[PDB]
Design an enzyme around this catalytic site. Structure first.
Site, mmCIF file in Angstrom:
data_model
loop_
_atom_site.group_PDB
_atom_site.id
_atom_site.type_symbol
_atom_site.label_atom_id
_atom_site.label_comp_id
_atom_site.label_asym_id
_atom_site.label_seq_id
_atom_site.Cartn_x
_atom_site.Cartn_y
_atom_site.Cartn_z
ATOM 1 N N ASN A 1 -17.683 22.893 -25.722
ATOM 2 C CA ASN A 1 -18.392 22.015 -24.782
ATOM 3 C C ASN A 1 -18.143 22.324 -23.293
ATOM 4 O O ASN A 1 -17.042 22.725 -22.910
ATOM 5 C CB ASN A 1 -18.011 20.569 -25.059
ATOM 6 C CG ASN A 1 -18.291 20.157 -26.491
ATOM 7 O OD1 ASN A 1 -19.394 20.348 -27.001
ATOM 8 N ND2 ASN A 1 -17.293 19.573 -27.143
ATOM 9 N N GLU B 1 -19.467 18.467 -16.903
ATOM 10 C CA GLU B 1 -19.682 17.044 -17.123
ATOM 11 C C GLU B 1 -18.678 16.256 -16.279
ATOM 12 O O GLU B 1 -19.017 15.236 -15.682
ATOM 13 C CB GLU B 1 -19.507 16.691 -18.595
ATOM 14 C CG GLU B 1 -20.394 17.472 -19.535
ATOM 15 C CD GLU B 1 -19.984 17.276 -20.986
ATOM 16 O OE1 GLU B 1 -20.500 16.347 -21.651
ATOM 17 O OE2 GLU B 1 -19.122 18.049 -21.451
ATOM 18 N N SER C 1 -13.769 20.502 -30.045
ATOM 19 C CA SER C 1 -13.779 19.162 -30.619
ATOM 20 C C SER C 1 -12.781 19.096 -31.763
ATOM 21 O O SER C 1 -12.807 19.928 -32.674
ATOM 22 C CB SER C 1 -15.182 18.846 -31.127
ATOM 23 O OG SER C 1 -15.186 17.723 -31.977
ATOM 24 N N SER D 1 0.820 -1.205 0.000
ATOM 25 C CA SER D 1 0.000 0.000 0.000
ATOM 26 C C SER D 1 0.857 1.260 0.000
ATOM 27 O O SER D 1 0.345 2.363 0.187
ATOM 28 C CB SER D 1 -0.939 0.013 1.224
ATOM 29 O OG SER D 1 -0.233 0.065 2.462
ATOM 30 N N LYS E 1 -7.509 3.316 2.870
ATOM 31 C CA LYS E 1 -6.536 4.343 2.479
ATOM 32 C C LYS E 1 -6.731 4.924 1.084
ATOM 33 O O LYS E 1 -6.907 6.127 0.918
ATOM 34 C CB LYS E 1 -5.114 3.784 2.566
ATOM 35 C CG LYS E 1 -4.702 3.339 3.943
ATOM 36 C CD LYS E 1 -3.335 2.670 3.911
ATOM 37 C CE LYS E 1 -2.888 2.308 5.321
ATOM 38 N NZ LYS E 1 -1.473 1.856 5.344
ATOM 39 N N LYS F 1 -17.908 23.250 -32.183
ATOM 40 C CA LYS F 1 -18.065 22.956 -30.761
ATOM 41 C C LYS F 1 -17.313 23.764 -29.705
ATOM 42 O O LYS F 1 -16.149 24.150 -29.856
ATOM 43 C CB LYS F 1 -17.802 21.468 -30.483
ATOM 44 C CG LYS F 1 -18.746 20.493 -31.158
ATOM 45 C CD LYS F 1 -20.203 20.655 -30.762
ATOM 46 C CE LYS F 1 -20.526 19.958 -29.470
ATOM 47 N NZ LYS F 1 -20.324 18.497 -29.454
ATOM 48 N N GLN G 1 -7.494 -2.595 4.989
ATOM 49 C CA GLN G 1 -6.472 -1.839 4.275
ATOM 50 C C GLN G 1 -6.969 -1.095 3.023
ATOM 51 O O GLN G 1 -6.308 -0.170 2.548
ATOM 52 C CB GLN G 1 -5.312 -2.773 3.933
ATOM 53 C CG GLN G 1 -4.137 -2.100 3.264
ATOM 54 C CD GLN G 1 -2.832 -2.780 3.605
ATOM 55 O OE1 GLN G 1 -2.263 -2.549 4.671
ATOM 56 N NE2 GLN G 1 -2.358 -3.637 2.711
ATOM 57 N N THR H 1 -40.294 22.419 -12.807
ATOM 58 C CA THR H 1 -40.592 21.193 -12.066
ATOM 59 C C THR H 1 -40.891 20.237 -13.254
ATOM 60 O O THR H 1 -41.624 20.613 -14.177
ATOM 61 C CB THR H 1 -41.803 21.331 -11.082
ATOM 62 O OG1 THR H 1 -43.028 21.478 -11.803
ATOM 63 C CG2 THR H 1 -41.605 22.532 -10.161
ATOM 64 N N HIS H 2 -40.291 19.046 -13.275
ATOM 65 C CA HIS H 2 -40.499 18.099 -14.391
ATOM 66 C C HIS H 2 -39.826 18.636 -15.669
ATOM 67 O O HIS H 2 -40.076 18.157 -16.777
ATOM 68 C CB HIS H 2 -41.996 17.905 -14.694
ATOM 69 C CG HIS H 2 -42.820 17.513 -13.507
ATOM 70 N ND1 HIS H 2 -43.235 16.216 -13.283
ATOM 71 C CD2 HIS H 2 -43.307 18.250 -12.478
ATOM 72 C CE1 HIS H 2 -43.946 16.174 -12.171
ATOM 73 N NE2 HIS H 2 -44.004 17.394 -11.662
#
Ligand SMILES: [Cl-]
Ligand SMILES: [Cl-]
Ligand SMILES: [Cl-]
Ligand SMILES: [Cl-]
Ligand SMILES: [Cl-]
Ligand SMILES: [Cl-]
Ligand SMILES: [Cl-]
Ligand SMILES: [Cl-]
Ligand SMILES: [Cl-]
Ligand SMILES: [Cl-]
Ligand SMILES: [Cl-]
Ligand SMILES: [Cl-]
Lengths: 449, 449, 449, 449
Positions: C274, C279, C266, C12, C314, C272, C311, C144-145
């Site tokens: 983005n 995201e 892109s 580890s 960690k 593009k 263990q 709403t929705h």
């Protein structure tokens, strides 16, 4: 018009009937605020509170009649009030949204549910603490890797579980505080347009305070996630204790046997006596965890504000509240009625578990631990190769490993002496255990209030 | 003697009554094998099959009476048979364990459930494939990062969902194969001691084969995990389609509106028409995932062989089977009755989505893509700074970026021309979409059988 | 002797080098307690603290050299001290176990990590609160929705997120309190046998208190689960805000655009831009949730006391601490540099969102809400059938629905008037928003200290 | 311009360097298809394949140099090719998207990874099957509820695990089939515009077939979820076997001890020999489950088509592939080198486990099982009250329970006779175990090919 299958998938009345009373209680509080806001005449209020109180009676007497069109409890109570008092019922809806009734009701239900859960949780901890006080002289093996490590008191074991359970109790109180915030008066998302008296609502419904933002009050379910999260960790603790007791209940370990009330036999194998109570409890950890996982997933990536997706919260909360209630009481019965075998716990006390003490012995005589550890290791191996336990090696055998060993090593080979080394706070010495018991009794006293 | 609360926590009859019929069916099959094994006389068998058939009738007529002591369906049917024919009933238990009845029944229930689910799943895929065939001329924007990317056919969109759903169908068939293995005859863990005819049991109960090891047959629940896992991924696909339709149903996007049968209004806001059907479906993803998470947790770290912890499987399977059945049918209604707005899907087709085509244009004239990409980028920015769309820049404007642009770039600015570039298998060109439709119709034909 | 593959699976050090400093710090504190306990001479202590301080330097200068045999950080520092000062190093191990070093170190690391996280979390909330104060006059649709509901202030939206994030901050403080309990001195499970001064250890390492039971201190990981749980809910909140901003960043919604620093283009599609930042953040919710799920599973059903299974904690803690740190700072940049389009937010304000206000209008004139709701509904539908928005119906049109409508309905059709109805605490009226802002500034002041 | 922190949070090169080779291989295949499509001249192709092959060498020689701007492996290889051959490199990007390179590469990596995993999985099953053949005469207790049930052969135990592991192997093959579908040629979502030869790509890259829809090929990650799901169940099986071996390794059970190569001691307790190998393996179940949970969450509710959220898949797949590889090999070492104690397994064989056989005895003499069960139960209790085992009751004692008992009950008290009752397929009789062994050897033969 609504597709019958979608309408069925959309109905939450089956489970949310459990919110019948808090829903009336919340409607009652809002009716009084509407009267104060000038929407209802004191005459109308009377008809309204009288009708509501009547519906409350119908539910408690188990005579309320759910009709097809009731997609939820809120819709049921509104329909019933209307058929009782007519057009006046419709005034109660003014400025009110289902998006706020839904979280207000569930929080009201959760507050009541937490009290019951707390009561039971505290009783479980008490049961462990009080038995630990009674069986304080019992010593048995302590394990790491499920391998015998160093001797510890049975009371030290019961208390580790009690202690963990106390943190569960504490987390439960913290969650209750955020649950205790009134969301009523948030409308569908923009708030209430009548200058409704939210403080009046708060004290009336007994919340500690009111929500700060209407958009958040209607979109959030942190209070559900929190509850589910703490309940899951509580279950985790119970799965570890179950794992322990089930193993200790084996014939190989033989440390204890549960009472007949918490076991069952086998319709095929006549000799069986199984610890069903503990296995059931252990499996509930997964059940409650699944509820937590589902809600976290339901919430992730959802846009503001309210979304129909949120409706899945009700059934998850109710199911976990009922699991807790049952699980906690059963755990209590188990701990208080199980029978330990002081004799076998004693027999399991073998010399190799004292190897660390044997190394400290040499350390006290001047040897650095690393060397003391390897020396003690050799004695363990010598005894093995010789087919005996270490307390059976001769003094000259120990001298062959290190001349530092003197006739007084005989004092190392005493289990009461072993555990009694751990007086520093938290250890397994008897004075430390009595200290813990006192601390926990106090902690419980404070948790209760 | 059993603690009432533990007994309640231990009862699975509430939900496992759903296994009433397969349990009789499994008992019937075993009764016949016991007669062949010499445990029952042909006279006894008759009384037994007659009694069982009678109990089956009681359940199907909804008149069976569950008593307090019935901790599960298996215990109920055994009690009932005994009170009907007496001591003879007790012979049916010979060599049989609950540990094997439990997995045999659940597998029998799952086989029947999968058929229903499959039927509905295939209908959903068909609905998408057939609408895609009808609306094959519709073009709208395609998105990555929820940003307009390149134009695609609406049919290409419906088919991506159909295709994913087909893999769900396929996985469902694979799981059915391992579900279709007979565990009856494994006893409590060591197998059956009567030389019971397992093959006779197999054909009688209609399983494809028998379990290989009695210890594994009784300890495993892979068939539950598998089911839950595939169902979860199926739901994942449905949550993505829901996310799509809900967004496309917004007034901002305006591509479509669901039918009234799959929407609901708001008791507070008169203008609302909400897509409840899709939100409900999206939230079920979490619900089913929670069921998967719970079972995986229930199983992890459990010792061989059978453990009472395993009892949590029943309710999780039944709940997910019912969720699937409802969700699949609702999804079908939605797709088949929703109304697209060909006009708005068309209006959303804007020039910037053709920027990639503009770069390929230059590539065809000799320019390496990297440069073609930056050139097209400049045109996009020039048009922005100018406050117009790119198809409105002048030819000399394009020349200022690259003299390679000729009057024929006008052909780049045609959406039908855009999508029609993708004829290579899988693309959005119309001939590719028709190919997909044919492939999927075949796939479904094969999935069905 | 150890199988190379198992030894690799067991190492580890790759990740737990992050605990190099707190491990020295904890060893230093224990060295001083050992001297006070009479295990080290003041001369030995000096050599020991000097060696440790030297190893600390090696790690901070990035020159420490990890050898093959180092299965973890604890083993590394012990080896290094021994090669620096010889046999004396071995005395430091007296009465000490890895089982206690492991939780002591991780808690020390977590305390430091929480401070950093808190600092960033508070900055995120501040960023939202201060922008909300600046853009307090902006009104846009509330949903709403994902359907337009009622108008709300953009500041009301920013504040719902700020408020939720504040509960995250609060939960973070509660977890810190239980993290702040010293486990050092619990040994391998039975406690410390030297009458080690735990209080001295506590103040030295800066913990608020000491563990109550040695068996629990070494077996529990509640502090890991808690952390992971709260971090997950925090991420959930961030996934919802991300979902919001990404949708609002669409060209269809057009409410805002992120800065170039928090977006990417892109390599294929030149047009593009983005919203990668959002995201990425949204997906981390799943990442952190997976860490929580893994630890809960690792713990479930494990027996007392310590088990090597533990263990796995960690790497999960370190990964989530790093995710939080990055995610929080990025979220801040996004909120503070994004550009809203006041013009488009204004254009999106359409009359149908005022249908609830139109019903209250009639309610004020005496009509019961239920009827007022259906009347307003009719106006919405009349306008639709007529192809216009409701504010365009004529007064006689409204009279055809209800003669109660008077020329003054014109006042209903004012968005500033709409939002200004919600003055009751928590609502979207401007005075309520200013109140919230003040409340949050105070909350932050208290959270900080 | 990109915010440094977001850029860091966005970088996947640290882990996705593991895809360096399959990425070159995929670029090579596409370069050849581009030449055939008329985008590259055969002269350009040469420069391109030569450059790519060179980059491949750089990675395999461990000399490739990652620069700051490399946000992923794809960006790295593209940069490197450009600095090697200039402008020509840029032509390779024609019609290609990262959205397709990403799934193509990961699938290529997964195919290679599955082969390795399969090889190891099959070796584990073989190890269990072959040892089961060698130790076929060993009998020990079988358990349900961790309570001694009925005697079974140690080989029957090893085989239950082998059998479960074989289903894991089977599921692994099914997943490989859907993984083996070529997504290259899907572009950013609309497909490929060059009429690229996808079949040529398929055979070149060695996929079994090509993707059906470009929008689905770029949006889906079913192949990741599937992998993670099957790997999780495989781990579940390993956690149960670990739970078994760890318990059997206790001194209380004493059935076996692992080899020193798969254990470790304690730096504090000299006597310890711990089964680290098994505990490590058991904990990985949680680790792998967390990876599954994270991806399912990352996917839920995401819109079509590609979203940056999907980037979290790489690290989860790589981590689980590495966990499997290590875990499987370690499990093999453990099973093949562990030492059973035939003597203790024999001593654990106690009479009460034969109580079911005692009831069948009476059943053979005519008594109905229900009565036979209670009679046997009485004998178990009589012996307990008498302080002896049941085989020590006298014949007249058995007669006091039922005169049906004759001197020949002595035959019931023979463990070899007990297990030998289970000859029906799947049971623990020796002939059944040999049958299983043969079946599994065949299954493995078929799995391998
Ligand atoms: Cl009045
Ligand atoms: Cl006793
Ligand atoms: Cl001496
Ligand atoms: Cl006959
Ligand atoms: Cl149209
Ligand atoms: Cl020209
Ligand atoms: Cl001194
Ligand atoms: Cl503006
Ligand atoms: Cl008028
Ligand atoms: Cl050429
Ligand atoms: Cl032996
Ligand atoms: Cl006789």
């Amino acid at each position: 018009s609504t597709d019958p299958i979608m309408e069925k998938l959309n109905s939450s009345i089956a489970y949310d009937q459990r919110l019948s009373e808090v829903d009336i209680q919340a409607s009652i509080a809002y009716a009084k605020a509407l009267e104060k806001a000038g929407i209802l005449t004191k005459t109308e209020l009377e008809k309204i509170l009288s009708g509501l109180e009547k519906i409350s009676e119908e539910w408690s007497k188990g005579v309320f009649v759910v009709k097809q069109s009731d997609e939820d409890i809120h819709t049921a109570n509104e329909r019933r009030l209307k058929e009782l008092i007519g057009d006046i019922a419709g005034k109660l809806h003014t400025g009110r949204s289902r998006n706020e009734q839904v979280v207000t009701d569930l929080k009201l239900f959760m507050k009541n549910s937490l009290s019951i859960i707390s009561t039971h949780l505290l009783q479980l901890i008490k049961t462990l603490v009080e038995r630990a006080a009674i069986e304080i002289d019992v010593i048995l093996p302590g394990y790491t890797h499920l391998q015998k490590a160093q001797p510890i008191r049975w009371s030290q074991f019961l208390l580790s579980h009690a202690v963990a359970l106390t943190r569960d109790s504490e987390r439960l109180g913290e969650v209750k505080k955020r649950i205790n915030v009134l969301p009523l008066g948030s409308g569908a998302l923009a708030g209430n347009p009548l200058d409704i008296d939210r403080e009046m609502l708060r004290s009336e419904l007994e919340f500690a305070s009111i929500s700060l933002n209407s958009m958040d009050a209607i979109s959030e379910r942190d209070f559900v996630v929190e509850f589910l999260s703490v309940a899951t960790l509580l279950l985790i603790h119970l799965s570890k204790m179950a794992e322990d007791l089930i193993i200790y209940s084996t014939s190989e370990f033989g440390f204890l046997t549960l009472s007949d009330a918490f076991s069952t036999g086998s319709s095929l194998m006549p000799q069986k006596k199984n610890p069903d109570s503990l296995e059931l409890i252990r499996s509930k950890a997964g059940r409650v965890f699944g509820r937590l996982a589902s809600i976290l997933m339901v919430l992730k990536g959802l846009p503001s504000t309210y979304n129909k997706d949120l409706q899945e919260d009700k059934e998850a909360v109710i199911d976990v509240v009922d699991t807790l209630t049952a699980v906690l009481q059963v755990a209590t019965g188990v701990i208080s009625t199980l029978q330990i075998s002081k004799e076998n716990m004693e027999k399991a006390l073998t010399p190799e578990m004292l190897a660390t003490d044997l190394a400290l012995y040499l350390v006290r005589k001047g040897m650095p631990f690393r060397q003391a550890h390897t020396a003690s290791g050799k004695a363990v191996h010598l005894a093995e190769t010789k087919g005996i336990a270490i307390n059976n090696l001769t003094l000259e055998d120990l001298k062959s490993i290190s001349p530092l060993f003197s006739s007084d090593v005989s004092q190392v080979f005493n289990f009461v002496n072993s555990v009694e080394q751990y007086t520093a706070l938290g250890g397994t010495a008897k004075s430390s255990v009595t200290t813990q018991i006192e601390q926990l009794r106090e902690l419980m006293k404070k948790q209760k209030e």
